Amino acid sequence: LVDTTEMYLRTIYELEEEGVTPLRARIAERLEQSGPTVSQTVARMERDGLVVVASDRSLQMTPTGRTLATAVMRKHRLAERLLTDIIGLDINKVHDEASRWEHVMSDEVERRLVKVLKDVSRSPFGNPIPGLDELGVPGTRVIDAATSMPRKVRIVQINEIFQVETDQFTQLLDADIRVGSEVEIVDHITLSHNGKDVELLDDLAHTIRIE
């Protein structure tokens, strides 16, 4: 959705990037929004813990706000590469188009673009694409990657070191399941490897990363 919050966050991100101090009036100018409206929006965002207004009245993105800002910027810039490299849209319109697509591109689409685009290091305008790490350029836990429909994934991490339950270690070993091993999930949770099914225990499901 075209969250205004996503918009304010990418704006603060751009300002820092250009080296400007993210002051409310600057954000108001660029967003073409009024001063009374931006302060009202920053107010809501502060209460949500997305940004904190410092003594000097500059806006400090909190770690979460920054994470969200980064994702919005990555999508925005990935959309710009898609629109100029693949679609061939007019360079003079790419920015505005991207400003809208950033709010509706899913992470799943982003991971794919990363696969189909020749170069994802910079946008057409010469700015680096932030947060590519979250797209494989540590991972999703099977518990929330738990598709009821089987899917061939790859183990990024097991986290045996965080296991209190050690019954399923040998089972993983027997099923040739390890880090870098492509398995198949269908969610309690079950992950197969060569017809070998390991019905995971909660702890394992909460820590094993299939990305």
Place this chain on the structure above:
Amino acid sequence: LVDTTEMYLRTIYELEEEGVTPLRARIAERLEQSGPTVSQTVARMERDGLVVVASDRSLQMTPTGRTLATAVMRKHRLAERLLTDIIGLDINKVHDEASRWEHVMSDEVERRLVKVLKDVSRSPFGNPIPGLDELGVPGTRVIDAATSMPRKVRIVQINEIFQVETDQFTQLLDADIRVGSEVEIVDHITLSHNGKDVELLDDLAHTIRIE
């Protein structure tokens, strides 16, 4: 923008298409919206002249509503072709992704997709893509295609038959400007052809179609 109105309109369009009678409760079911909310939305849409509720309580899209419904469906289906043919997104997610992109795809992006996609006749799900005519598969008048920055376009129509002013007919002829002739617009309005500049009069600007 994710207009809810665009959403209700595509919904009514799908129902007719499947052959179902567009009754409010059906729309409420599919949209996963409440009965009191849909009737409130149809109410606003009726006042806007987008749909009329018939005696049998079925919803009749007015010519304008239908035009808007068609455009939303074309974009939606073009997005589905883009997501499966180019991006390679998982078939099971293409629909939902498209349901969001339909509200942010510009017509300019649609005309380009029509150029880059191998087949635009049907969506991946086997439904025909409606309204391709508005994308060249009669045109934009120079008055509203009047970019202050020069752009090479193509005359689709002159409409001499609608001209009260006949001073610029020979000028068009002299500048080798006719239907199917690629010119360049920069907007009063001026359109060139081989270094020949014809500063158009309002009437001409209001009827000449450069698409």
